Structure formats: structure tokens, C-alpha cells
Structure 1
Amino acid sequence: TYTTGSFQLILGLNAPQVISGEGEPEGEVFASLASLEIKPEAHVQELEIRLDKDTRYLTQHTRNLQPGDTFHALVEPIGEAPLPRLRLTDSGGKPLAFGLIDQPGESVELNYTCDQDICELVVHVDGTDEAVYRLLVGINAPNLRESVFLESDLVTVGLAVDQIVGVDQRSENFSVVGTLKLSWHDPKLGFSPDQCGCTVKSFEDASIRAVAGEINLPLPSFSFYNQQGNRWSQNQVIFVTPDGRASYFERFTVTLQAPDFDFLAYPFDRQKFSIKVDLAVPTNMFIFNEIERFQQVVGDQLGEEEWVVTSYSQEITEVPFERGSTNSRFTTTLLVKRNLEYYILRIFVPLFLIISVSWVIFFLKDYGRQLEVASGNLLVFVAFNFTISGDLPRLGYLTVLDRFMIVSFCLTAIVVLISVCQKRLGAVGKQAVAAQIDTWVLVIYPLVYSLYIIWVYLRFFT
């Protein structure tokens, strides 16, 4: 490949000390730059820009200009959009030129010439008196009638999840173990091998912020948006190639807040585990551009897990940033569900059998036995309820399971009340009414249970 960088050139005429590399300037000059003999090379760039309702002001930064250079810019709307104002300022905000509306009043143009040793310019386009405009800019190109701007550095990102290690249903947070990777290109980080005799330079056990502060160069630092407390990190390394290609690697264990949890439909609920990585720099410096899948996003492990992942996705977006501008965001989302067989077999079948015991006793015609069995079955129900109390999260609000337990307990107690009434009726000599009540209860109870189940399904799952 070729190479890039700055250089120092020493030329001598009949001065044998030059080949030592230490020749100090002397005598009268004899050579000059060749490019000065011809017209300077022009650079031209065109951009399409749009001023949304909340984004009526736009600014762009230019590359450095050498003394004697010239700058030209013009703006022409795509359609019937009104002509915006155009102006040019340096990096401090000092005005240098203002746009002039042409006599065929469809465009605005600007011109400037460089006096200082180094000039850094900013182009302002504003319509704050879906409009879309065409912006044309050139250096040493007066023929604009018939890259100049700086470009953001592109970052590649990737993330993999190894294990979900905990979920807190009262404080609404979860913890995850995984791996993160970043990669970008920066010519300012390049070095010359002959000064170190090596091809790879590395930094270990340091955050990107610390390395950036040590080498005094801007780097794409990041943070987890919903991080709770400190983060544990292993195998943290940064290494750079002579061309300037850099990469970051980290293995992390972190706890993330998740206020989006909703446990109303427990245990039939479905949840989302979202992991957000945000750059700590403005979008005009660094931006996420590509997604790399270095491993499986969701890793398989031996044995069963409490949460089963159904699907996942990865996406890049932009979010508002402090001190204006914008910062990039990388999001990983996992869709998870619980193990249904566990809850069904552990809770619902025994509950059904307990309910059946209280239902079947109405076939008896000896009401004392019916009363005694109902009284015993209520105690059995309460004992089973606290036995399963361990799988009953205390959240401060009702779930589906709590409502079902309450309804079942109420019906079980009403059975005892009806049994007492039937016993009294049989004692007074009205056995026919007791038999009619038995038939009514035997018909009605399963209908009530089925109707309650239908109502719950309608009100919670559709």
C-alpha cells in the first residue's frame, strides 16, 4: 500500500553536510515550489439540506484554508421554498461575509478571501425569519454558477449476550453478561514502525476516556444508558495499527434499570430486555454506521432457564444530546417469556382438583357429611394457598393469579354457607327444597367458573 503523513525536506547545493540530515539554512535560495506556477486546483462539493420545523438552523465546518485562497458558496431551493439567509463566520463566531440575493431573485451567493495563516470557516444557513434546499460550495472555484466540509468518523459496533443472571421484579431491573466490540479508523493515531520495531500498539485495563486523556486525542467514548451502580469489566484492551485502524474489546457484567416492565398478566406476561449503548460525543465527531455480528447475539447454554428468548433485534438511531446536537445510540432488544408448564402443573391442576372436591359433595343426601367435608376442604384450600405462596410475588397490585385465588376462596366459603342452610332445612323437614338447591348448585357452579374465565380472558388478553 501507499503511506500518508507529514514530512520535512532539506535540499542542498554543493553542501556535503546535507546528507547528515542536520544542514541549517544558509546562502541564497535556489529552488521553489512548482505548483505555484499554475492555477490552484479547485474543490467542489454539493449537499442537499432540509429545514424541518424544529431544525430551522444549520451549521457546517470547513477544512483549513491557506493564505491567498478563496471561498465561494451558493444556495438554490428545490422548489417553491422561500429563500433562507446565508452567512459565513470563523470558528469563534466572528462574521466574515454575508449572502447577497441575486437580481434574478432565486439564489443567494457569498464570497471571501483568506488573509490569516490558517482560516477555519463555518457556513450558516437559517430560515428562522419540509422545505429543502441545494447547497453548493467550492474552494478556488469561482465557476460554481456553471470534500470541502469535514466528515464524521465512522464506527462499527457489535454486542453479544451470554447469560441473563437475574431479574428483580420489585425494583424493575435485570443483570446480564456479554461482550462488546468497537472499531474505527483515524489517521491521527497512525505511527511509523521504524520507531518502535512493532506492528501493533496496545493499551490495557483502561477506559477509552482515560486513554483519550493520556494521548490528548478525541476518541469515541460510550456509556450504558440505564446503568445501576458500577460495572465489572474484564479483558479490556485497545490496540492500533500503523495505518490508524483502532479497535476496542470488553467483557462486561452490568445491572440495567427497566421501568417498562408490566406484570399485570402474570404469569402469562411477556417482557422486553433492552440494552442501550450511547456515544458520549456529538454526532459531528463520531457516529455509529455499521453493525457487526462477531458471535451469536443470544448464546445457548446447557440446562433450562427461567426466561425463554423468542426473538431479538438490533438497530441504530439518534437521540438528543446535552449541549445541543445529537448522539448515536445502539440498541439490542430481547423478547422473553416464562415457562408455562411449570406454573400450569404446579398450581392449576391441584386447584382444579380441590374445586372438584367441593363440587362433588352436593350429590350426597346426608347433609351433615356434606357440611363436614366442606369445612375440611376450605382448610385444605387455605393450606395449599400458603404452600404456593412462594410463587406469589408481592408487588402491591393485583395480578391474574391473585384474582383467581380470591374468587376460588370466596366460592369455597359460599359452599359451606349453603351446606349449613341445607342442614337446617333438612332439620325442619323441608328435604325437597334442599334437593332442589343441590340440583341448582350442581348446575350453576361450573357455569360461573367458565364465565369468570371468559371475562378474564376478554379483559386482560384482547
Structure 2
Amino acid sequence: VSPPPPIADEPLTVNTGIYLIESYSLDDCAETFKVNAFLSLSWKDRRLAFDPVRSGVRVKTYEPEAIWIPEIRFVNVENARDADVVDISVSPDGTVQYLERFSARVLSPLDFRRYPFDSQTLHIYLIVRSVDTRNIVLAVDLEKVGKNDDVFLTGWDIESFTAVVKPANFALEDRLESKLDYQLRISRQYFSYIPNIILPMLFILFISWTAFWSTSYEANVTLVVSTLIAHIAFNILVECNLPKTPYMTYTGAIIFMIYLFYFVAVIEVTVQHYLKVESQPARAASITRASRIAFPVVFLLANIILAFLFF
């Protein structure tokens, strides 16, 4: 089989549609997600046209091998999609209506800057390479683009599934290629992060601040050092759940800034003890009394500045 010939000099229009059946496995570290969907293709092949009168059939079914099917591939897949042809239907004018069910692991980058309050646009790129005979161009049949209502992605809210109707036509290895951009808009469900990471992390920090109402250096050293260890435990936990970014993330900034607070609290605790030993507890008392106000204030201000910069 060869491509359908041009009546006039026109390129072949392959109408496409993707209908999500299932979406799963959004791997943050890998920046990948798995998809299970219907891929619909439609093109005109005059060679397959027939008269319904002499045939007695309004449609004609063909096996994939029997006819010419445009070679449609996904740009951003890990391995080539697992596809199973559902149905191939030919109308009397030779209009082919193809339908396959596929599953693929899509590689699409994520912006972690606002984690865990981030939204993402996942992309699925359809592509077709033009042949020497004729040029092949993709189009979106919006009637055949959608998603099942039950489509869920664990830990994410599925906003929309749409297609950028205008293809990106360009040359690659001395042949033209028509590229289409399907978009899955999702926003992270930040709920869990509050009682699991954020609040426990604030409690341990506030506990370190009780050292500002204590004169016992040994108790203070314990308070500040122990809580610092718990902060390291959470930092490590967070960095395990995320890839290494060339930028700072929101949570990453909060976490880093909290280290400075422990470092300064250690300095205060050290200073207060030194003065007490040098028989000048009145200076020490002033610093400790200031610290009780300064620490929550500077912490609250820095957090406002950060949230402002990030949102």
C-alpha cells in the first residue's frame, strides 16, 4: 500500500482526537505520567470509495494490513505506545474512520517552583512525517477530543483536557512533520502537606523557641539541637519526594530559611550562656527578652516576603 494520491496538489489532512479513559502514575522525580486513551484518525482515500447501491452497504470494514493508515507517532513517549485497533470504517466517499485504544508513558516536564501549591500543564504531542509522494498534515476534530468523567490522578485535581487546534508544521531530516499539542491541565492537592510536613515542621521550630524562656544552657542546647535534627529529617523526606531543580522551590525556601533560625537560636543560646558565666546576666536577660519577640516577628515577616516572591 502507498498514500492516497492528491486530486489537486493539496496535502493530506489527518483529523485526530484523543479521548482519555485512564490517567495514572504521575511520577514527580521522573516527570512522567501514564495514559490510557482512544486515538481516533480520519482521512480521505478515494481509492477505497464505493457506490452504496451496487454494494448494499453504507460502510465497509477493513483490517489494518489491508489499507493505508498514516504513521502517527507520539513525540514525548518513553517507549512507543501499546496500541490495539478497535475499528476501521470506510464511508462511500472513501472517508476512513480509524480507532485504536492505546497506553503510553509520557515524558512531560514539571515546574516545581510553587510546590506543593503548583499546577501543571501535561503535554501529549502527536506527529506525522510527510512522504515523498505527498505531504501529511494533522488537524483536531474537537468532537473526538475528551475524557471520561471518572478520570482521576492520585494527589491531583484534573482541570481540563484540550488540544491546540493549529499544528506546528516544520522540517526534520529533509521532510515535513505536522506536530499537534494535546494538553492535560492539573493542579496539586496540597491538603496532605499541611498536617504531614508544614505543621509538624512549625511545631518543632516553636519548641526550639521555648529556649528563650530558659536560663539552663544544657536544657537549651538539648532543645535547639534536638529540634534541629527533626528539621533535617523533614528536609531529607521532602528532597526524596522531589527532583533536583536548578531553581529554588517554595517548600525548599521555607526549609532553608528555617535552618538560619536554628543557627541564630544556637548563637543566642551560646551568647546568653557566655554572659551568665562572665557574671553579666542583665545583658543576657535583654538579648533573651528581645529574642522572644524578634524570632516570631522576623519569621512571620520573612514568610510574607517569601510567599510574595513565590505567588
Q: TM-score, normalised by structure 2?
A: 0.80
Deviations 1:3-56 (A, max 9, x none): xxxxxxxxxxxxxxxxxxxxxxxxxxxxxxxxxxxxxxxxxxxxxxxxxxxxxx
- AA of the residue aligned to 1:252: F
1:124 paired residue number: none
Deviations 1:416-446 (A, max 9, x none): 3322332232233211111101112112112
SS state at 2:282 partner: helix
SS state at 1:268 partner: coil
- Aligned-CA RMSD value: 3.4
Distance 2:6 2:281 in 1: 101
1:432–1:322 Cα change, 3 Å: closer
1:277–1:382 Cα change, 3 Å: closer
SS state at 1:301 partner: coil
Deviations 1:183-224 (A, max 9, x none): 2333320246799876644334x4xxxx3xx55xx5533221
1:180 paired residue number: 39
In the TM superposition, what is the alpha-carbon distance from 1:248 to its structure 2 partner?
0.3
1:136 paired residue number: none
In the TM superposition, what is the alpha-carbon distance from 1:343 to its structure 2 partner?
1.4
In the TM superposition, what is the alpha-carbon distance from 1:302 to its structure 2 partner?
7.6
Distance 2:186 2:113 in 1: 16
1:267 paired residue number: 116
1:32-431 → structure 2 map (5 Å cutoff): 149-191=8-50, 200-204=59-63, 206=64, 211=65, 215=67, 219-258=69-108, 260-281=109-130, 285-289=135-139, 291-294=141-144, 297-301=146-150, 305-314=154-163, 315-322=165-172, 326-386=176-236, 388-389=237-238, 392-395=241-244, 397=246, 398-431=248-281
1:230–1:324 Cα change, 3 Å: closer
Q: Does 1:453 align with 2:306?
A: no
Asked whether the equivalents of residues 114 and 310 of structure 2 are also in contact (C-alpha less than 8 Å), the reply is yes
* Percent identity of paired positions between Structure 1 and Structure 2: 25
Instruction: Please identify which structure carries the higher helix content.
Output: 2
Structure 2 segments unaligned to the other structure (5+ residues) = none
- AA of the residue aligned to 1:269: D
Higher RCO, Cα 8 Å, sep 6+: 2
1:191–1:375 Cα change, 3 Å: closer
Q: TM-score, normalised by structure 1?
A: 0.57
1:219–1:433 Cα change, 3 Å: same
- AA of the residue aligned to 2:121: K
1:444–1:290 Cα change, 3 Å: closer
Asked whether the equivalents of residues 14 and 41 of structure 2 are also in contact (C-alpha less than 8 Å), the reply is yes
Asked whether the equivalents of residues 267 and 401 of structure 1 are also in contact (C-alpha less than 8 Å), the reply is yes
In the TM superposition, what is the alpha-carbon distance from 1:161 to its structure 2 partner?
1.6
Asked whether the equivalents of residues 224 and 266 of structure 2 are also in contact (C-alpha less than 8 Å), the reply is yes
How many residues are aligned here?
Answer: 304
- AA of the residue aligned to 1:178: A
In the TM superposition, what is the alpha-carbon distance from 1:225 to its structure 2 partner?
1.9
Distance 2:119 2:152 in 1: 22
Deviations 1:92-137 (A, max 9, x none): xxxxxxxxxxxxxxxxxxxxxxxxxxxxxxxxxxxxxxxxxxxxxx
The higher radius of gyration belongs to: 1
Asked whether the equivalents of residues 279 and 329 of structure 1 are also in contact (C-alpha less than 8 Å), the reply is yes
Distance 1:372 1:244 in 2: 81
SS state at 1:293 partner: helix
- AA of the residue aligned to 1:405: I
Asked whether the equivalents of residues 153 and 186 of structure 1 are also in contact (C-alpha less than 8 Å), the reply is no
Structure 1 segments unaligned to the other structure (5+ residues) = 1-60, 64-148
Deviates more, 1:354-363 or 1:401-410: 401-410
In the TM superposition, what is the alpha-carbon distance from 1:182 to its structure 2 partner?
1.9
